[PDB]
Coordinates of C-alpha atoms in Angstrom, one line a residue:
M101 CA 0.0 0.0 0.0
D102 CA 1.0 3.6 -0.5
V103 CA 2.9 5.2 2.4
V104 CA 0.7 8.0 3.6
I105 CA 2.7 11.1 4.6
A106 CA 1.1 14.3 5.8
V107 CA 2.3 17.9 5.5
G108 CA 1.0 19.7 8.6
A109 CA 1.7 23.4 8.2
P110 CA 0.2 26.9 8.1
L111 CA -1.0 26.8 4.6
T112 CA -3.2 29.9 5.1
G113 CA -2.9 32.8 7.5
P114 CA 0.0 35.1 8.4
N115 CA 2.5 32.3 8.0
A116 CA 1.3 31.0 4.6
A117 CA 4.7 31.7 3.1
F118 CA 6.3 29.3 5.5
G119 CA 3.5 26.8 4.9
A120 CA 4.5 27.0 1.2
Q121 CA 8.2 26.5 2.0
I122 CA 7.3 23.3 3.9
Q123 CA 4.6 22.1 1.4
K124 CA 6.7 22.7 -1.7
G125 CA 9.7 21.1 -0.2
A126 CA 7.9 18.0 1.0
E127 CA 5.9 17.6 -2.2
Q128 CA 9.0 17.8 -4.4
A129 CA 10.8 15.3 -2.3
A130 CA 7.9 12.9 -2.4
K131 CA 7.8 13.3 -6.2
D132 CA 11.5 12.7 -6.6
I133 CA 11.5 9.7 -4.2
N134 CA 8.4 8.3 -6.0
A135 CA 10.1 8.5 -9.4
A136 CA 13.1 6.8 -7.9
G137 CA 11.0 3.9 -6.8
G138 CA 9.3 5.1 -3.6
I139 CA 9.9 3.9 -0.1
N140 CA 10.6 0.2 0.1
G141 CA 8.8 -0.4 -3.2
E142 CA 5.7 1.6 -2.3
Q143 CA 4.7 5.1 -3.4
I144 CA 4.3 8.0 -1.1
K145 CA 0.9 9.5 -0.9
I146 CA 0.9 13.1 0.3
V147 CA -2.0 14.6 2.3
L148 CA -2.2 18.2 3.4
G149 CA -3.4 19.7 6.7
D150 CA -3.7 23.4 7.2
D151 CA -3.1 24.3 10.9
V152 CA -3.4 28.1 10.4
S153 CA -0.7 28.4 13.1
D154 CA -3.5 27.7 15.6
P155 CA -2.9 25.0 18.3
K156 CA -6.5 24.0 18.5
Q157 CA -6.9 23.8 14.7
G158 CA -3.6 21.8 14.7
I159 CA -5.2 19.2 17.0
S160 CA -8.2 18.9 14.6
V161 CA -5.7 18.5 11.7
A162 CA -3.8 15.9 13.7
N163 CA -6.9 13.8 14.5
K164 CA -7.9 14.0 10.8
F165 CA -4.5 12.7 9.8
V166 CA -5.0 9.8 12.1
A167 CA -8.4 9.0 10.6
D168 CA -6.9 9.3 7.1
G169 CA -4.3 6.6 7.8
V170 CA -1.3 9.0 8.0
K171 CA 1.9 7.2 9.1
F172 CA 4.4 10.1 9.0
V173 CA 4.0 13.9 9.4
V174 CA 6.4 16.5 8.0
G175 CA 5.6 19.4 10.2
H176 CA 4.4 21.5 11.8
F177 CA 5.9 25.0 11.5
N178 CA 5.0 26.6 14.9
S179 CA 6.3 25.1 18.1
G180 CA 3.0 25.8 19.8
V181 CA 1.2 23.7 17.2
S182 CA 3.8 20.9 17.0
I183 CA 4.0 20.3 20.7
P184 CA 0.4 19.4 21.3
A185 CA 0.0 17.7 17.9
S186 CA 2.9 15.4 18.6
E187 CA 0.9 13.9 21.5
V188 CA -1.9 12.9 19.1
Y189 CA 0.7 11.4 16.8
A190 CA 2.6 9.6 19.5
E191 CA -0.5 7.9 20.8
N192 CA -1.5 6.8 17.3
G193 CA 1.7 5.4 15.9
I194 CA 2.7 8.4 13.8
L195 CA 6.3 9.7 13.4
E196 CA 6.5 13.5 13.3
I197 CA 9.6 15.1 11.8
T198 CA 9.5 18.9 11.9
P199 CA 11.6 21.0 9.5
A200 CA 11.0 24.2 11.4
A201 CA 9.7 24.0 15.0
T202 CA 12.6 24.9 17.2
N203 CA 11.4 25.1 20.8
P204 CA 13.4 22.6 23.1
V205 CA 10.2 21.2 24.6
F206 CA 9.3 19.4 21.4
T207 CA 12.2 16.9 21.8
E208 CA 12.5 17.0 25.6
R209 CA 9.5 14.9 26.5
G210 CA 10.9 11.5 25.9
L211 CA 8.6 10.8 23.0
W212 CA 9.5 8.0 20.6
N213 CA 8.1 9.9 17.6
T214 CA 9.6 13.4 17.6
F215 CA 12.4 14.4 15.2
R216 CA 13.6 17.6 13.6
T217 CA 15.8 18.6 10.6
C218 CA 16.2 22.1 12.2
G219 CA 18.0 23.3 15.3
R220 CA 16.6 24.2 18.7
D221 CA 16.3 27.5 20.6
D222 CA 18.7 26.9 23.4
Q223 CA 21.3 26.6 20.6
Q224 CA 19.9 29.5 18.7
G225 CA 19.5 31.8 21.8
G226 CA 23.1 30.9 22.8
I227 CA 24.4 32.2 19.5
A228 CA 22.2 35.3 19.6
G229 CA 22.9 36.2 23.2
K230 CA 26.7 35.9 22.7
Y231 CA 26.4 37.9 19.5
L232 CA 24.8 40.7 21.3
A233 CA 27.6 40.8 23.9
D234 CA 30.3 40.5 21.2
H235 CA 29.0 43.2 18.8
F236 CA 26.6 45.4 20.8
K237 CA 28.4 45.3 24.2
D238 CA 27.2 48.7 25.4
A239 CA 23.8 48.8 23.7
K240 CA 20.5 49.3 25.5
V241 CA 18.6 46.2 24.4
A242 CA 14.9 45.6 24.5
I243 CA 13.8 42.0 24.4
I244 CA 10.4 41.7 22.8
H245 CA 8.5 38.5 22.2
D246 CA 5.1 37.4 20.8
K247 CA 3.9 35.5 23.9
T248 CA 3.9 32.2 22.1
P249 CA 5.8 29.1 23.1
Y250 CA 8.3 29.7 20.3
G251 CA 8.6 33.4 20.5
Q252 CA 8.8 33.8 24.3
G253 CA 10.9 30.6 24.4
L254 CA 13.5 32.1 22.0
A255 CA 13.5 35.5 23.8
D256 CA 14.1 33.7 27.1
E257 CA 17.0 31.6 25.7
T258 CA 18.6 34.7 24.2
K259 CA 18.0 36.6 27.4
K260 CA 19.7 33.9 29.4
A261 CA 22.7 33.8 27.1
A262 CA 23.0 37.5 26.8
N263 CA 22.8 38.0 30.6
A264 CA 25.5 35.4 31.2
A265 CA 27.7 37.2 28.6
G266 CA 27.2 40.6 30.3
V267 CA 24.3 42.1 28.4
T268 CA 21.4 43.1 30.7
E269 CA 18.3 44.2 28.7
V270 CA 16.6 47.4 29.7
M271 CA 13.2 46.1 28.7
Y272 CA 11.4 42.7 28.4
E273 CA 8.0 42.9 26.9
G274 CA 5.4 40.7 25.2
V275 CA 3.1 41.7 22.4
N276 CA 0.2 39.7 20.9
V277 CA 0.3 37.9 17.6
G278 CA -2.0 40.0 15.3
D279 CA -1.2 43.3 16.9
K280 CA -0.8 46.1 14.2
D281 CA 0.0 49.2 16.3
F282 CA 3.3 49.1 18.2
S283 CA 3.4 52.8 18.9
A284 CA 3.2 52.6 22.7
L285 CA 6.0 50.0 22.8
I286 CA 8.2 51.9 20.4
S287 CA 7.7 55.1 22.4
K288 CA 8.7 53.2 25.6
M289 CA 11.8 51.9 23.8
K290 CA 12.6 55.4 22.7
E291 CA 12.3 56.7 26.3
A292 CA 14.6 53.8 27.4
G293 CA 17.3 54.7 24.8
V294 CA 17.0 51.4 23.1
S295 CA 19.4 50.8 20.2
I296 CA 18.8 47.1 19.7
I297 CA 15.4 45.4 19.5
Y298 CA 15.7 41.6 20.0
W299 CA 12.6 40.0 18.6
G300 CA 11.4 36.5 19.7
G301 CA 8.7 35.9 17.1
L302 CA 7.8 35.7 13.4
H303 CA 8.0 37.9 10.4
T304 CA 4.6 39.6 10.3
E305 CA 5.0 41.4 13.7
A306 CA 8.8 41.9 13.1
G307 CA 8.2 43.7 9.8
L308 CA 5.6 46.0 11.4
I309 CA 7.9 46.8 14.3
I310 CA 10.8 47.6 11.9
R311 CA 8.6 49.8 9.8
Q312 CA 7.0 51.7 12.7
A313 CA 10.3 52.1 14.6
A314 CA 11.8 53.9 11.5
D315 CA 8.7 56.0 11.1
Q316 CA 8.8 57.1 14.7
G317 CA 12.5 57.8 14.6
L318 CA 13.6 55.0 17.0
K319 CA 17.1 54.3 15.7
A320 CA 17.3 50.7 16.8
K321 CA 18.4 47.7 14.8
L322 CA 16.1 44.7 15.0
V323 CA 17.8 41.3 15.7
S324 CA 15.7 38.2 15.5
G325 CA 15.8 34.5 14.7
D326 CA 14.7 31.9 12.2
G327 CA 11.1 33.1 12.4
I328 CA 11.8 36.0 10.1
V329 CA 13.3 34.1 7.1
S330 CA 10.8 34.9 4.4
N331 CA 11.3 37.4 1.7
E332 CA 7.8 38.7 2.7
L333 CA 9.6 40.5 5.5
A334 CA 11.0 43.0 3.1
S335 CA 7.5 43.8 1.8
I336 CA 6.0 44.1 5.2
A337 CA 8.9 46.2 6.7
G338 CA 9.7 48.2 3.6
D339 CA 13.1 49.6 3.0
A340 CA 13.6 50.0 6.7
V341 CA 14.4 46.3 6.7
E342 CA 18.0 47.1 5.6
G343 CA 20.4 46.2 8.4
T344 CA 18.1 43.8 10.2
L345 CA 20.0 40.8 11.7
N346 CA 18.8 37.3 12.4
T347 CA 20.0 33.8 13.1
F348 CA 19.2 30.8 11.0
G349 CA 20.9 27.5 10.2
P350 CA 22.9 26.8 7.1
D351 CA 21.3 28.2 4.0
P352 CA 20.9 24.9 2.0
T353 CA 20.2 26.8 -1.3
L354 CA 23.9 27.6 -1.3
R355 CA 25.2 24.1 -1.1
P356 CA 26.7 23.2 -4.5
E357 CA 25.1 19.7 -4.3
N358 CA 21.7 21.4 -4.4
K359 CA 22.3 23.5 -7.5
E360 CA 20.1 21.4 -9.8
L361 CA 17.4 21.0 -7.2
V362 CA 17.2 24.7 -6.5
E363 CA 17.0 25.4 -10.3
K364 CA 14.2 22.9 -10.6
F365 CA 12.0 24.7 -7.9
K366 CA 12.7 28.1 -9.6
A367 CA 11.8 26.8 -13.0
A368 CA 8.5 25.7 -11.5
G369 CA 7.9 29.2 -10.2
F370 CA 8.9 28.7 -6.5
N371 CA 11.9 30.3 -4.7
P372 CA 12.9 27.4 -2.4
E373 CA 14.2 29.6 0.4
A374 CA 14.8 28.9 4.0
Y375 CA 12.8 25.9 5.3
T376 CA 12.0 24.6 1.8
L377 CA 15.0 22.2 1.7
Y378 CA 14.7 21.5 5.4
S379 CA 11.3 20.0 4.6
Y380 CA 12.7 18.3 1.5
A381 CA 15.4 16.8 3.8
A382 CA 12.8 15.6 6.3
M383 CA 11.2 13.5 3.6
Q384 CA 14.6 12.1 2.5
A385 CA 15.3 11.2 6.1
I386 CA 12.1 9.2 6.4
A387 CA 12.9 7.3 3.1
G388 CA 16.5 6.6 4.1
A389 CA 15.6 5.4 7.6
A390 CA 12.7 3.2 6.2
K391 CA 15.2 1.5 3.8
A392 CA 17.7 1.0 6.7
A393 CA 14.9 -0.4 8.9
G394 CA 13.5 -2.6 6.1
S395 CA 10.2 -1.4 7.3
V396 CA 7.7 1.5 6.9
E397 CA 6.3 1.0 10.4
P398 CA 6.7 4.4 12.0
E399 CA 8.1 3.0 15.3
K400 CA 10.8 1.0 13.4
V401 CA 11.6 4.0 11.2
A402 CA 12.1 6.1 14.4
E403 CA 14.6 3.5 15.7
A404 CA 16.5 3.5 12.5
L405 CA 16.7 7.3 12.4
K406 CA 18.5 7.2 15.7
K407 CA 21.0 4.6 14.7
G408 CA 22.0 5.7 11.2
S409 CA 23.0 8.6 9.0
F410 CA 21.4 9.5 5.8
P411 CA 22.2 11.8 2.8
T412 CA 19.9 14.8 2.4
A413 CA 19.7 18.2 0.9
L414 CA 21.1 19.5 4.3
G415 CA 24.1 17.1 4.1
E416 CA 24.5 13.8 6.0
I417 CA 21.9 13.8 8.7
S418 CA 22.0 11.8 11.9
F419 CA 20.0 12.2 15.2
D420 CA 20.6 12.0 18.9
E421 CA 18.5 10.0 21.4
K422 CA 16.0 12.8 21.6
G423 CA 15.4 13.2 17.9
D424 CA 17.5 16.3 17.3
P425 CA 19.7 16.3 14.2
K426 CA 23.5 16.5 14.4
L427 CA 24.0 19.3 11.8
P428 CA 25.8 22.6 11.7
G429 CA 24.6 25.3 14.0
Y430 CA 23.1 28.8 13.8
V431 CA 24.9 31.7 12.2
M432 CA 24.0 35.4 11.9
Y433 CA 22.5 36.8 8.7
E434 CA 22.0 40.5 7.7
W435 CA 19.3 42.0 5.4
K436 CA 21.0 43.7 2.5
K437 CA 20.2 44.6 -1.1
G438 CA 20.9 41.8 -3.6
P439 CA 21.6 41.8 -7.3
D440 CA 17.9 42.3 -8.1
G441 CA 17.8 45.3 -5.8
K442 CA 15.5 43.4 -3.4
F443 CA 16.3 43.1 0.3
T444 CA 17.2 39.6 1.5
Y445 CA 19.2 37.8 4.2
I446 CA 22.9 37.0 3.6
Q447 CA 25.3 35.3 6.0
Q448 CA 27.7 37.8 7.6

């Protein structure tokens, strides 16, 4: 029978661009693997589930995956969705490999079924906090987060690392996802002499903060993490995006081995940026581990993932006992004008 693999992701809503990275990456991998002969002689059947970045909707999606005979999930994007969804999967024999959910809790619960192809926020915050101390030693820093498990989680890891390294923030504030007016917060930051805004959250609110800070004359550079890696940020923020910094893992579109794959996506009209190839690689990991296990049973595939290493678009992937990948760490990117005159993120 076909191996039923789900993409669980924000296919609509503010994070639709990330949903597309994940969906396109997983779909292309399934297509490529299928043409190569599938997984253990069976074809992958993709099903889609739109979580709209909402934990409750994510649970509905997860339960429907179960009913639909899903065996593997690539997803979700948001940590706050992936954490509760993974419980449904764990209790119903479904292996979940996230290409993008970074909060440590996801793999720190002893669950048999939880894996990632991305890093985690204690790593990411460690890098960010040290970066702040190294490059903005004397800056007045505001740590702002979006009150979600991911956003506040990353802000807290960065705070911990920054504080240890000798940077003590002057402000720590939460905002709500969906807020459109940051004038009060920006004025408070102006009064506090803030010159660095560290943002624990995603690109929609980050872009609005960047735009509004510039309009209000708050001369502060925004520094964030993986949650802002969509070219949409440049549209939302406008030209004020220039100079923004953020952490992200290796940019797999730059790996020479991926040249043809990247060109294939672009020829089909999709820019396979950021998490696209992390999702592609998640699918490759499932296929590689299933072959090694001589089984498509999710529990056996999980065991094989932890014992082996597998070629992917991210390089050779292997996993620790918790399901976290053994891959290169976070580095800092800066938003600059590219050849096309469009702003995008480039490693420093």
